[PDB]
Design a protein around this ligand. Structure first.
Ligand SMILES: CC(=O)N[C@@H]1[C@@H](O)[C@H](O)[C@@H](CO)O[C@H]1O
Ligand SMILES: *[C@@H]1O[C@H](CO)[C@@H](O)[C@H](O)[C@H]1NC(C)=O
Ligand SMILES: *[C@@H]1O[C@H](CO)[C@@H](O)[C@H](O)[C@H]1NC(C)=O
Ligand SMILES: *[C@@H]1O[C@H](CO)[C@@H](O)[C@H](O)[C@H]1NC(C)=O
Ligand SMILES: *[C@@H]1O[C@H](CO)[C@@H](O)[C@H](O)[C@H]1NC(C)=O
Ligand SMILES: *[C@@H]1O[C@H](CO)[C@@H](O)[C@H](O)[C@H]1NC(C)=O
Lengths: 212, 325, 217
């Protein structure tokens, strides 16, 4: 079977009621839930069949039947901001859900977008890195799209995202498009296009090779 | 009076002059059986059973564990090993005062859920604690037709317990001093496979196939059992290669065995020279289904075992304990 | 706590890795033990399990490269993953589960996990990073690109650690080479760009490499 979870991200303020959803491709008797923080292993929340494992605080509850299941946190505490996965036992392979990220709610914030050409120093090494930085945005969901002379670049870029900042509750993101020198020398216009809730039209930042 | 878990006691007709180790154990742990045992039918009563969530099974498991640890204890891995007489005797489990055993006499009870022709008894039937994998020996047989049982058939991870209605005699014999072998009638075994495929067919929706074990410890890949104090390991490849719309199995005696009851190993003396022979009634099977990658062309079932709780389960499935209050 | 393990680490592609999982007698005797891996930024993947009976079960998707086994002599369970690929790079856990098979309650749920064994498949050897500068524009943004080092970690500061306000050092990403790369950036006033000197101090201890690189227009 297959399990899908929603939403991908849940933004919430402390005190608010969290409810995470898990959907199953076929009828299940139950599903179990795990909490995961970074660098640590999953921690079982809800046993199967229900309700909740030992050591799990009262604010955790779970429910559902058949195709549909949900995990409810009555009053969210700071400790609860984490990733939650659901898991199924109908037959092997036992599938985990993709996980729902619970983060701290904040006012929508548009990214500050910057783009960086490869240094003259780097070009020597025979490789070229083109970087697109998205600074201090919210929500976490953001889309970057690379174009080289209006050619959509797919599969040859990598993104990296900071953890939600504990002080201003924003995120930052880098996207590095990697080209060989020969390929980089062959094209003029390098651009990254950003789509985000904080932007009313996707924003494109670009540069021309060989111009200051 | 609702289902409650408590320590039962056991009864048996063990013989006190006999040094056979089941008789010795039973003499100490069990009491003589009641001459005229009462059985009472409960009219207009429905009661639920669950052989897979049955504490009786656990108690028996614990009991047989202490039985082997007391009777056999050779040597290894940190530790004298005289030879011993080994032949299971029937054990009855009986309810103390303030408790009672409900017994399902329903025909073709599949092991879980409602039983409407329920009765109460003082003791279980006599159950011989035979230690075996993949095949069940000297057990009980369903009277009407073969019965297969599972906690959820759709969970491939979950074991399947087959109860036969006709038994199949299997003769194993040792006249390489460690080489032995088992014999059974082929045509009757083919027909056994048939009566199993018919019941599997009731669930499927799918064409059935039997394969030998995929691997694991020696104890569960082979038909492993005890005979005259010696541990037999039989290749069951010949029993389990089949596809549906006399058989000599080569066996080996092993001195170094895994203890089914705890982590470690036991090492015994080589088998005694002379005559070793066991004629046993095959009365059931423990099967496991592959799943995960089935195909519309084949469902694969393989011989199972290893958790002896399932062995006890095959006999105790009809019973449950309640606190009579 | 209940389940210890000791899996490998850096593996060259094509090789095999064997991970062991030492269990308490109780867990080993009464519980199922799953083998589960988790790659970075992804959720958990079930690879296989070992039941208390000794039954081995593997994921159809790993069955040609994955072998499970148990040692009844010591109470240890094992997984071997062969034909390693860079995308087999993950934390590998053994973890127990009653699976409705323990005697009381009959509960499912993975309640105890081993500490995890990180497996990184690559041919890379220890290597210090190359640090290239990310020069300011025309609020301005500037930074350092720290590329191609192995293994983790590298540390980065700015102006000898005298600059923390508005700095973001991204978590490293593992490139297709099998070497890491990250970026460290900072946002600063445009007025100060003409005067203020900005230097990132990078340190990759594993290779005794320390670089201080000034990125400027
Ligand atoms: C050596 C041996 O296998 N002997 C038995 C024989 O005693 C038994 O009567 C027969 C029944 O099928 O099966 C065989
Ligand atoms: C077995 O589990 C499945 C879902 O996991 C469920 O649909 C089915 O009903 C269960 N078995 C029985 C007998 O209900
Ligand atoms: C009713 O009880 C009788 C024993 O008196 C038993 O043989 C029978 O199986 C029960 N009914 C059904 C439908 O099985
Ligand atoms: C079991 O029997 C089959 C066929 O008789 C044979 O191919 C296989 O090697 C045997 N293996 C063992 C361990 O006896
Ligand atoms: C199982 O069967 C296969 C082929 O059918 C054979 O290669 C293997 O050795 C057999 N082993 C056992 C224990 O049956
Ligand atoms: C099965 O029963 C017969 C007679 O009751 C006995 O002689 C034989 O040893 C038993 N075999 C096993 C494997 O229990």
């Amino acid at each position: 079977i297959v399990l899908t979870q929603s939403p991908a991200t849940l933004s919430l303020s402390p005190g608010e009621r969290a409810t995470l959803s898990c959907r199953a491709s076929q009828g299940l008797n139950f599903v179990v839930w795990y909490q995961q923080k970074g660098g640590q292993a999953p921690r079982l929340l809800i046993h199967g069949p229900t309700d909740r494992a030992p050591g799990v605080p009262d604010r955790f509850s779970a429910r559902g039947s058949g195709t549909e299941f949900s995990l409810v946190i009555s009053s969210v505490e700071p400790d609860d901001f984490a990733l939650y996965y659901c898991q199924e036992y109908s037959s092997t392979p036992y599938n985990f859900g993709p996980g729902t990220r619970v983060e701290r709610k904040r006012t929508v914030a548009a990214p500050s977008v910057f783009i960086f050409p490869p240094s003259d120093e780097q070009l020597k090494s025979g490789t070229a890195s083109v970087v697109c930085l998205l600074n201090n945005f919210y929500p976490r969901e953001a889309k970057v799209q690379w174009k080289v002379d209006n050619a959509l670049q797919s599969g040859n870029s990598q993104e990296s995202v900071t953890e939600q900042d504990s002080k201003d509750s924003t995120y930052s993101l880098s996207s590095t498009l990697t080209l060989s020198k020969a390929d980089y020398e062959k094209h003029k216009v390098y651009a990254c296009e950003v789509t985000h809730q904080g932007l009313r039209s996707p924003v494109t930042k670009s540069f021309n090779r060989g111009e200051c | 009076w609702k289902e409650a878990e408590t320590t039962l006691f056991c009864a048996s007709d063990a013989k006190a002059y006999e040094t056979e180790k089941h008789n010795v154990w039973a003499t100490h742990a069990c009491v003589p059986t009641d001459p005229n045992p009462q059985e009472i039918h409960l009219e207009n009563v429905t009661e639920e059973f669950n052989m897979w969530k049955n504490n009786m099974v656990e108690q028996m498991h614990t009991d047989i564990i202490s039985l082997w640890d007391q009777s056999l204890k050779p040597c290894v891995k940190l530790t004298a090993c005289p030879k011993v007489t080994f032949e299971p005797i029937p054990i009855h489990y009986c309810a103390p005062a303030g408790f009672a055993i409900l017994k399902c006499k329903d025909e073709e009870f599949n092991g879980i859920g409602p039983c409407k022709n329920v009765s109460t008894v003082q003791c279980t039937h006599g159950i011989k604690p035979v230690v075996s994998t993949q095949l069940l020996l000297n057990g009980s047989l369903a009277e009407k037709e073969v019965k297969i049982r599972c906690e959820n058939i759709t969970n491939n991870a979950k074991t399947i317990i087959v109860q036969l209605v006709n038994p199949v005699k299997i003769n194993c014999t040792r006249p390489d001093i460690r080489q032995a072998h088992c014999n059974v009638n082929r045509t009757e075994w083919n027909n056994t496979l048939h009566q199993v495929v018919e019941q599997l067919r009731k669930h499927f929706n799918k064409t059935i196939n039997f394969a030998n074990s995929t691997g694991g410890d020696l104890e569960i890949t082979t038909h492993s059992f005890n005979c005259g104090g010696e541990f037999f390991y039989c290749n069951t490849t010949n029993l389990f290669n089949s596809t549906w719309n006399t058989i000599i199995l080569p066996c080996r005696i092993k001195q170094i065995i895994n203890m089914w009851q705890r982590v470690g190993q036991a090492m015994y003396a080589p088998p005694i020279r002379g005559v070793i022979r066991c004629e046993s009634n095959i009365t059931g099977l423990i099967l496991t289904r592959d799943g995960g990658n089935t195909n519309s062309t084949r469902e694969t079932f393989r011989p199972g075992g290893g958790d002896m709780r399932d062995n006890w389960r095959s006999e105790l499935y009809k019973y449950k304990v309640v606190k009579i209050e | 706590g209940q389940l210890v393990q000791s899996g490998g680490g850096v593996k060259k592609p094509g090789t095999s890795v064997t991970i062991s999982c030492l269990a308490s007698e109780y867990t080993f005797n009464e519980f199922v033990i799953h083998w589960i891996r988790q790659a970075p930024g992804q959720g958990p993947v079930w690879l296989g399990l070992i039941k208390r009976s000794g039954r081995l079960m593997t994921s159809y998707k790993f069955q040609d490269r994955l072998s499970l086994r148990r040692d009844r002599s010591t109470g240890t369970v094992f997984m071997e993953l062969r034909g390693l690929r860079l995308d087999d790079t993950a934390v590998y856990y053994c973890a127990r589960d009653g699976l409705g098979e323990v005697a009381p309650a009959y509960l499912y749920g993975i309640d105890a996990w081993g500490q995890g064994s990180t497996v990184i498949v690559t041919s890379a050897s220890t290597k210090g990073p190359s640090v290239f500068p990310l020069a300011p524009s025309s609020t301005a943004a500037l930074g350092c690109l720290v590329k191609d080092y192995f293994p983790e970690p590298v540390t980065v500061s700015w102006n000898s650690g005298a600059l923390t306000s508005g700095v973001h050092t991204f978590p490293a990403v593992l490139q297709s080479s099998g070497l890491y790369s990250l970026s460290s950036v900072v946002t600063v006033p445009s007025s100060s760009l003409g005067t203020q000197t900005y230097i990132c101090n990078v340190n990759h201890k594993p290779s005794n490499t320390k670089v201080d690189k000034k990125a400027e227009p």
